[PDB]
Design a protein around this motif. Structure first.
Motif, short mmCIF file in Angstrom:
data_model
loop_
_atom_site.label_atom_id
_atom_site.label_comp_id
_atom_site.label_asym_id
_atom_site.label_seq_id
_atom_site.Cartn_x
_atom_site.Cartn_y
_atom_site.Cartn_z
N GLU A 140 4.73 3.82 -14.33
CA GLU A 140 3.64 4.49 -13.64
C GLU A 140 3.03 5.61 -14.48
N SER A 174 5.49 9.54 -8.51
CA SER A 174 4.77 9.18 -7.30
C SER A 174 5.68 9.36 -6.09
N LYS A 175 5.07 9.76 -4.97
CA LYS A 175 5.78 9.83 -3.70
C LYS A 175 6.00 8.47 -3.08
N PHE A 176 5.42 7.42 -3.66
CA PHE A 176 5.66 6.05 -3.22
C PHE A 176 7.12 5.67 -3.39
N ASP A 236 6.40 2.83 2.99
CA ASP A 236 7.03 2.23 4.16
C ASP A 236 6.78 0.73 4.21
N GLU A 237 5.70 0.26 3.58
CA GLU A 237 5.43 -1.17 3.52
C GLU A 237 6.32 -1.86 2.50
N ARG A 270 13.89 5.15 2.73
CA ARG A 270 14.09 4.14 3.75
C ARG A 270 15.15 3.12 3.37
N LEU A 276 0.83 -1.20 0.00
CA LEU A 276 0.00 0.00 0.00
C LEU A 276 0.86 1.25 0.00
N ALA A 299 9.19 -0.77 1.50
CA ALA A 299 10.57 -0.68 1.98
C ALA A 299 10.88 -1.81 2.94
N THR A 304 3.54 8.68 -14.28
CA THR A 304 3.52 9.91 -13.50
C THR A 304 4.46 9.68 -12.32
#
Lengths: 447, 27, 48
Positions: A298, A302-304, A268-269, A311, A265, A271, A300
């Protein structure tokens, strides 16, 4: 006579071969030293090779090199038992002489040699113990502790029952009898190691397998007159594959990192799921490349993938070098293939990590703005990089970091006015021209 | 150990209740 | 699927006080043979 002449320089050269080999004997050189020693006639230089071991031991510069020396002897005793047979004799008498001489320095030199040889199965446990009985018959305690610290590990394995009896008499020394102070603290240290189990008397050069050393465990007792054969060290007169064109191991790994990256999601997950896998250090450059390529699917930014990459870097330093190696590998090599929809994803991606100091400003020094060492798609990557530096930091804070960066690629100052005219024309085309105030002062002086 | 994290139980949660520490959050 | 996802669990006593950050992960859906089923939040580009 030329035959006496020929044999004497032959005797000399053998003597002049063994002595530099022993003086160059060290760990990780033992096998090369023994190989060259084998080609010289060891058997003719029987006492010569023995005496060069004895004197290099005794000299008291060595002692440190004693386990290196004893390991060569076991090689020799494996190859020729007679060499170790004679050499074990001299070391007995050298102990017996210096014990009678009370030369405490030279005794301990011999005893460290006899200890290690017992560690290398050269000599029997019998010849060790009787020395221990003699030393413990007097005080002699400085000598006997250095013995038992190195040999008691193997000795308690082999001859536990008699060895335990040695401790019990030894234990009677400390508790029920009065002892000189400095000697006494060394004695109880042996007791301390005994609970600690001897794990610091049990390291050395076990080159030889227990069936590759031919088990000539010489059963000689330090009460045997031992034939003191110095005479053979004198001179005499002998009248005698499928090639891997495919990378399917990498593809199954490249799928697993992609399936991690899509099943999460938050960043942090993903990572934590990449840090859970414990990826080996040769692949951690490739895992960054799978992250960057999946960031371009993607379509675009993303901050993901940013907070994924943040991390990574703060976890271990090997991830931080992996992003530093990939940022050079992207800019110098990968820009030629990337479309302009993919370059706005990357410049905002690398602009985010640089503006939050996950990559240093010194990685921007690699990028150079010339007519020659510049790509038209490379100038597009610089444009989308600096915009994320402006929007995050501001125009004043980015001015401070570029002044601390002392780079020459974006900022030519030393001359070459066609490059100063180039970089002002490029930066004002981006929309940021407040930083070009340094160059226009440098430009008009050249005019 | 249950250091203030996790669930009161895994009965009504429709999960397993398996808690693992985030290796990402360290500094 | 949207639920084969590690759920962030972080110290409910102190999470009411401040924003702790994601310190631990709770398991989301459990299965004997591990499959990383994707979720559409990775397939829907966000509003920003």
């Amino acid at each position: 006579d030329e035959d006496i002449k020929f044999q004497r320089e032959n005797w000399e050269m053998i003597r002049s071969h063994v002595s530099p080999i022993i003086s160059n004997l060290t760990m990780d050189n033992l096998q090369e030293s023994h190989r060259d020693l084998f080609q010289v006639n060891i058997l003719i230089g029987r006492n010569i090779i023995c005496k060069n071991v004895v004197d290099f031991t005794l000299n008291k510069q060595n002692g440190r090199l004693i386990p290196a020396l004893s390991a060569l002897i076991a090689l020799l005793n494996s190859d020729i038992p007679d060499i170790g047979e004679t050499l074990a004799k001299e070391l007995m008498l050298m102990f017996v002489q210096q014990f009678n001489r009370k030369d405490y320095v030279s005794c301990g030199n011999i005893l460290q040699c006899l200890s290690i040889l017992f560690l290398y199965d050269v000599i029997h446990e019998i010849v060790i113990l009787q020395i221990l009985l003699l030393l413990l018959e007097k005080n002699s305690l400085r000598l006997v502790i250095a013995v038992m610290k190195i040999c008691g590990w193997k000795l308690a394995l082999v001859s536990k029952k008699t060895h335990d009896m040695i401790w019990e008499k030894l234990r009677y020394i400390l508790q029920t009898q009065e002892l000189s102070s400095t000697l006494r603290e060394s004695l109880e240290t042996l007791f301390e190691i005994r609970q600690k189990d001897y794990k610091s008397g049990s390291q050395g050069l076990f080159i030889l397998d227990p069936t590759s050393y031919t088990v000539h465990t010489h059963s000689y007792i330090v009460s045997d007159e031992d034939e003191a054969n110095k005479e053979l060290g004198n001179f005499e007169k002998c009248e005698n594959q499928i090639y891997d064109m495919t990378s399917t191991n990498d593809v199954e790994f490249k799928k697993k990192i992609y399936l991690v990256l899509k099943s999460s999601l938050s960043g942090d997950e993903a990572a934590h799921k990449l840090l859970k896998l414990k990826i080996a250090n040769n692949l951690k450059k490739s895992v960054v490349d799978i992250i960057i390529k999946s960031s371009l699917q993607e379509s675009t930014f993303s901050k993901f993938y940013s907070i994924l990459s943040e991390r990574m870097i703060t976890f271990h330093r090997s991830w931080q070098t992996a992003y530093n190696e990939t940022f050079e590998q992207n800019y110098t090599q990968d820009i030629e293939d990337y479309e302009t929809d993919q370059l706005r994803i990357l410049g905002k991606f690398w602009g985010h990590l640089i503006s939050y100091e996950f990559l240093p400003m010194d990685c921007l020094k690699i990028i150079k703005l010339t007519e020659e060492e510049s790509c038209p798609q490379g100038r597009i990557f610089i444009k989308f990089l600096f915009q994320e530096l402006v929007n995050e930091l501001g125009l004043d804070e980015l001015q401070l970091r570029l002044n601390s960066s002392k780079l020459d690629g974006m900022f030519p100052l030393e001359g070459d006015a066609e490059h100063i005219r180039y970089s002002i024309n490029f930066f004002t085309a981006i929309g940021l021209g407040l930083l070009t105030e340094d160059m226009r002062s440098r430009l008009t002086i050249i005019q | 150990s249950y250091n203030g994290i996790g669930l009161k139980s895994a009965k009504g949660s429709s999960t397993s209740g398996h808690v693992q520490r985030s290796l990402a959050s360290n500094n | 699927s949207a639920s084969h996802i590690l759920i962030p669990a972080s110290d409910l006593s102190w999470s009411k006080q401040t924003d702790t950050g994601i310190t631990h992960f709770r398991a989301g859906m459990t299965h004997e043979d591990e499959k990383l089923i994707p979720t559409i939040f990775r397939y829907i580009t966000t509003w920003e």
